[PDB]
Amino acid sequence: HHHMSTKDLIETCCAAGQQWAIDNDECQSDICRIAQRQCCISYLKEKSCVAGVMGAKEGETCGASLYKQCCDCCGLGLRVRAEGQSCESNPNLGYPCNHVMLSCCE
Amino acid sequence: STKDLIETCCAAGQQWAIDNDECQEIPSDICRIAQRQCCISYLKEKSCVAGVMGAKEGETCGGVSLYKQCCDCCGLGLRVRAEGQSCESNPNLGYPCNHVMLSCCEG
Amino acid sequence: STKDLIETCCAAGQQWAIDNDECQEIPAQSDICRIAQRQCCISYLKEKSCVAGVMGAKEGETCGCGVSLYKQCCDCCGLGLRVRAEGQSCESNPNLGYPCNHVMLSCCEG
Amino acid sequence: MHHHHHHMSTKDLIETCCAAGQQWAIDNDECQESDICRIAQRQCCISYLKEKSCVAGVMGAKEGETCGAESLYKQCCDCCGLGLRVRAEGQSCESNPNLGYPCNHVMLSCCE
Amino acid sequence: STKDLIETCCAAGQQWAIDNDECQEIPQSDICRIAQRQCCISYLKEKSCVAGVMGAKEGETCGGVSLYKQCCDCCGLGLRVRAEGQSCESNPNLGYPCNHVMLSCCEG
Amino acid sequence: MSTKDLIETCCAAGQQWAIDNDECQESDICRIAQRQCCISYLKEKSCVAGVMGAKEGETCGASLYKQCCDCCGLGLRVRAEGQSCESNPNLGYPCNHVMLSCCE
Amino acid sequence: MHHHHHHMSTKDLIETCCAAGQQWAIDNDECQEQSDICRIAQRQCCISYLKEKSCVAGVMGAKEGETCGAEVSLYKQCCDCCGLGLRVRAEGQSCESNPNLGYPCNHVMLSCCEG
Amino acid sequence: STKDLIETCCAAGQQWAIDNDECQEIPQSDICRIAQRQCCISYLKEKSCVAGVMGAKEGETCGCGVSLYKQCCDCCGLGLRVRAEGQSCESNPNLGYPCNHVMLSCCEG
């Protein structure tokens, strides 16, 4: 077994997952596995998203993915800003698209 | 305007999500991006809400579906609440997992 | 239980309201659940739009198949404001309905 | 141009136009019918029709009528039906303010 | 005299407006043709404007030389302000006759 | 925003749109005020150009350019004949005003 | 969201949920039936009731000559353990507590041996 | 004698439990088989129970085998929570054995 509350186990397994994501670029007792996987995936998602945003700002192609999603959503904001128009929050775009579009627009 | 075009193409995307339950064969870059993103967001939020309800109903938790993710994350919050403990925000869990865990933990 | 199902489906409805600004296309499901979902979705949007409406009126905005009470609560608040502005006290008028009466009184008193 | 001016207080105007609205609702079943007056008229007109349709809805549910598919008739029928189903299961009614007004009140009344 | 010719040709233009509801067709001197056309257009404009004002006051949806829509819209501005218990302010940027019509509808 | 302020705001936007772009394609209250102030600006500008055209001896054509050019031309022709100007309100606005101004 | 809160002590909640569990066991023979405290107490009291009942049936089974079974319910266990005590008694030997048999086997063996 | 056979087969069962952590394939008279199985199960039950209790005291939150790990952890947890509230422990035999005993033990100090 383990000798740890459910809250502490979540914290512990979350940190392990993040650490696994940093160590390896992939996310390969149920409570622990869920927290591990979720924190692993979130780290890789946020990283790919930030790379995507930087890609758009640098003029790089988004492709044809959180890289692509964040690149495209940043591109929306850039194009609006380029037209001299003000940015408006559109929650229908979802997360993180809306936030990314606004950030790139402002 | 670009703002109105986004709104228009966003509504088309939502409508496509309702009609087909997928965003793969969806039909300017601005329009295509807004369509796809609003299509995906709709399916994500729908599957997430279903997932939360699943967890509260005692279902086993186990494309764009957040059914499993939201079910799992809700389940974290429920288990902590069931132990009489308070939950703490953990942004490392990501979105919407953190928010869903907290919501399920605090009622 | 039915009570827990109502709570569960109610929270789903509220969550749907927060996520999308509508309850018309709220997505193998029981009537009890569908009713609670829709009703909690609508209540959330009504209360939110109402509070926004009240703030609108107090900030000097002139209001004059959805569920928004923006306009209603703005107008009803405006009634109370105008009475207050004339130095008069308000009187409860339940015929105005809910939440118009309550909102008018609240805006009339302070 | 000459016009007829009146100097009725806002409070009195609200009362007056409210009574007119209610009376219009009673006379005709629609609310097609100064901003102060128009708001009070419409709101009192609509409240009357809403309360009436709501009470009809409650009676509908208690009689076993269908509420409709996918309106205050329908809303109050559905909300009453929640309370009825809970009562039918032998369970006690719990206030749920999240259901809003008048749904919560109607659910409780039909439950108890 | 030129003054009398203007009056004469002006009355002809008004008459043409009444008869035919347009000013494209001419029923001779530049002075006369100009006065005819201008008085024809003015008559149709003022008529359509007054109809537009009445439309707005009667609750009609608003909307060539016709000012029906313009005067209906501009009246509607004044009505809405009046309905809110506020006084109107002259705004010359609205142009003529929009400003005048808005004010008239706002005052009563 | 109050209705009065919204009218002012949307009016100024319309004028600004007219100045920026030479056309008026661009709440109902806001859209009406925008369009009306846009159109008035373009109308007054074309009218003033028309008046200047007439005074410079330019042809009016065979439009507020043409209207104001023609109306100015009435006043010019009366003045040229040595006759005094008389207000004729039946000519309407701005024709009457323009004719008088060009006549005096 | 509005929620209904209650503030019952842990001790009272245990008592309450324990009584519910026992009642459920009496009403229905399963223990399938929101806080962990309540769920634990309910389940434990439900299962204990069914265990003690099946055990007593098992003891009576052994005394009546019934087969215990082969290879929640303590029917078999208590029947077998009673049978141990009966066989010792049948040999004219005195009963000796053997705690290694565990609970309730030891107690049941002794009772059947002496009784 | 029957008594000695019980003791013998009981010790075999215990020994099997110590060697392997199971009694499902416990490898002959009925008396012997019963004693073997029962002593095997009791040993694993008591062991898992004591581990469970220690788990709860060390801050673990536990809420078709023979393990009492979870049961004894949960029951200990009841006693701990009551003690943590400053309240006195009350015996509740309806909780059964060993839940009641374990709850009390964890409650008292």
Numbering used by the authors:
A (entry chain D): 423 to 450, 459 to 494, 503 to 544
B (entry chain C): 427 to 453, 459 to 493, 501 to 545
C (entry chain F): 427 to 453, 457 to 493, 500 to 545
D (entry chain E): 419 to 451, 459 to 495, 503 to 544
E (entry chain G): 427 to 453, 458 to 493, 501 to 545
F (entry chain H): 426 to 451, 459 to 494, 503 to 544
G (entry chain A): 419 to 451, 458 to 495, 502 to 545
H (entry chain B): 427 to 453, 458 to 493, 500 to 545
What does the paper say about this structure?
Fibulin-2 is a multidomain, disulfide-rich, homodimeric protein which belongs to a broader extracellular matrix family. It plays an important role in the development of elastic fiber structures. Malfunction of fibulin due to mutation or poor expression can result in a variety of diseases including synpolydactyly, limb abnormalities, eye disorders leading to blindness, cardiovascular diseases and cancer. The three anaphylatoxin-like modules (C435-C543) following the N-domain are also found in fibulin-1, but not in other fibulins.
We were able to obtain diffracting crystals and solved the structure in the P21 space group at 2.2 Å resolution. The structure included four dimers (AB, CD, EF and GH) in the asymmetric unit, with each dimer in a local two-fold symmetry. The overall structure of each chain is predominantly α-helical, which is consistent with the CD data. There are four alpha helices (T428-D445 for α1, D460-E488 for α2, L504-A520 for α3, Y533-E544 for α4) which all run in the same direction. The loop structures between α1 and α2 (N446-S459) and between α2 and α3 (G499-S503) were incompletely modelled in all 8 chains indicating the flexible nature of these regions. The structure has a disulfide bond architecture which stabilizes the three anaphylatoxin modules. In total, 8 intra-molecular disulfide bonds are found in the domain. All of this suggests that in fibulin-2, the three anaphylatoxin modules are all embedded into a single-domain four-helix structure forming a dimer with covalent bonding via C500. Cys500 locates in the flexible α2-α3 loop, which is only partly visible in the electron density maps. When combined with the non-reducing SDS-PAGE and MS, which both indicate that all of the protein is in a disulfide linked homodimer, the crystal structure data implies that the inter-subunit disulfide is formed, but that it is not stabilizing the flexible nature of the α2-α3 loop.
